[PDB]
Design an enzyme around this catalytic site. Structure first.
Site, PDB file in Angstrom:
ATOM      1  N   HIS A   1       0.866  -1.179  -0.098  1.00 49.41           N
ATOM      2  CA  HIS A   1      -0.146   0.030  -0.072  1.00 49.41           C
ATOM      3  C   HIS A   1       0.835   1.464  -0.118  1.00 49.41           C
ATOM      4  CE1 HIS A   1      -2.894  -3.187   1.282  1.00 49.41           C
ATOM      5  NE2 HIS A   1      -3.810  -2.594   0.523  1.00 49.41           N
TER       6      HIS A   1
ATOM      7  N   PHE B   1      -8.245 -16.543  -3.939  1.00 48.96           N
ATOM      8  CA  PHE B   1      -8.401 -15.183  -4.264  1.00 48.96           C
ATOM      9  C   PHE B   1      -9.227 -14.905  -5.626  1.00 48.96           C
ATOM     10  CE2 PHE B   1      -6.602 -10.653  -5.131  1.00 48.96           C
ATOM     11  CZ  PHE B   1      -7.488 -10.006  -4.552  1.00 48.96           C
TER      12      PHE B   1
END
Ligand SMILES: COc1ccc2c(Nc3c(Cl)cncc3Cl)cc(=O)oc2c1OC1CCCC1
Ligand SMILES: [Mg+2]
Ligand SMILES: [Zn+2]
EC number: 3.1.4.53
Length: 345
Positions: free
Chosen positions: A94, A306
């Site tokens: 991030h 995922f």
């Protein structure tokens, strides 16, 4: 002057980290600005690691947003560098690179043929801005980590979308630093409408909202109206902001749909960050969260899961909405799934 800045501008490309040695390499890379194949990693390397400011500047010139909303290059670059500066460089995933990728991807989605002429320049402005600030000042741990450690932020927001609310507070607060008000020339009505749309889009990046978000989207696909030429018809604000909510959510979850070369790099970064959280949890005597344990991790298997539970279901619906514009993304996603499938030990 440089082709990297508006005609007649005094802005120096060196101000946002580009040396003359990399001007051509970067301009070449930027020829893919409007394509899914763009390599944000190269852009980062060619700009002293300021891909967010670099990609946002290219996007705003490309979409003519600086002139439309009367934003001077100086104001813009001051705000972007300030924002990029608020993305933690020591956080593995991030950081500003992730934001640059989401912004750039959002930029590409906004131009999908099926959505042509649907959005106002203001909505376009809000989507890209939202993408750019969506994870600003992320600490590298999840909302649950913040909730469990009794984080000041978690108390402040009553454990509800802690990070996302914070990203919003920071993204807008920085507009007030010296020479950073890029929305100064929008009307009062426009700033109010943009604020509401940005808030909406960033809160939707909260994973816990994914299921609810995916469901509403499927409902919309059911009742979708289209023109003779095949372009989507989004008559009212409600349908437009719902699509935009999903667009940024799709951009946030677009890693597995990029070339395998990029996808793999994105996967190493997210795993690295999750392990950082794993260590932090151990150091604080907390139970190690799932997948945050480097020892009992199974990267390949996790990616496949995922994709099967989260990414494929979401993109299949998006591909449905903008049919047939996302078929390629769908095939790449499938190819990438099988590769990770085959790499499971
Ligand atoms: C390329 O691999 C990615 C990339 C991104 C994510 C991911 N991103 C987000 C989003 Cl979109 C929103 N809030 C938090 C995260 Cl971490 C969530 C999320 O649950 O998993 C992500 C992911 O794979 C995870 C690593 C092992 C299994 C899951
Ligand atoms: Mg986020
Ligand atoms: Zn994100």
């Amino acid at each position: 002057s440089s082709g990297l800045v508006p005609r007649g501008s005094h802005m120096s490309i060196s101000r946002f980290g580009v040396n003359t040695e990399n001007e051509d390499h970067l301009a070449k890379e930027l020829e893919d600005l409007n394509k899914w194949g763009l390599n944000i990693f190269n852009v980062a390397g060619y700009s002293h690691n300021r891909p967010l400011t670099c990609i946002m500047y290219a996007i705003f010139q490309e979409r003519d947003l600086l002139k439309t909303f009367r934003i001077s290059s100086d104001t813009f670059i001051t705000y972007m560098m300030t924002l990029e500066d608020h993305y933690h460089s020591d956080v593995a995933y991030h950081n500003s690179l992730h934001a640059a990728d989401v912004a750039q991807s959002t930029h590409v989605l906004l131009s999908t043929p099926a959505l042509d002429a649907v959005f106002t320049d203001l909505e376009i402005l809000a989507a890209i801005f939202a993408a750019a600030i969506h994870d600003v000042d992320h600490p590298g741990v999840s909302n649950q980590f913040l909730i469990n450690t009794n984080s000041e932020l978690a108390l402040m927001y009553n454990d509800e979308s802690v990070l996302e609310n914070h990203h919003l507070a920071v993204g807008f607060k920085l507009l007030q630093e010296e020479h950073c008000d890029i929305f100064m020339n929008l009307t009062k009505k426009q700033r109010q409408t943009l604020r509401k749309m940005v808030i909406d889009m960033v809160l939707a990046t909260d994973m816990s909202k994914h299921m609810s978000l995916l469901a509403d989207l499927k409902t919309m696909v059911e009742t979708k109206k289209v023109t003779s030429s095949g372009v989507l018809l989004l008559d009212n604000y409600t349908d437009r902001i719902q699509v935009l909510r999903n667009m940024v959510h799709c951009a946030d979850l677009s890693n597995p749909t990029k070339s395998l070369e990029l996808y793999r790099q994105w996967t190493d970064r997210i795993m690295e960050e999750f392990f950082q959280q794993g260590d932090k949890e151990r150091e604080r005597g907390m139970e190690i969260s799932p997948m945050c344990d480097k020892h009992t991790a199974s990267v390949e298997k996790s990616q496949v899961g995922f994709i099967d539970y989260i990414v494929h279901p979401l993109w299949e619906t998006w591909a449905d909405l903008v049919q047939p514009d996302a078929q390629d993304i769908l095939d790449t996603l499938e190819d990438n799934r099988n590769w990770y499938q085959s790499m499971i030990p």
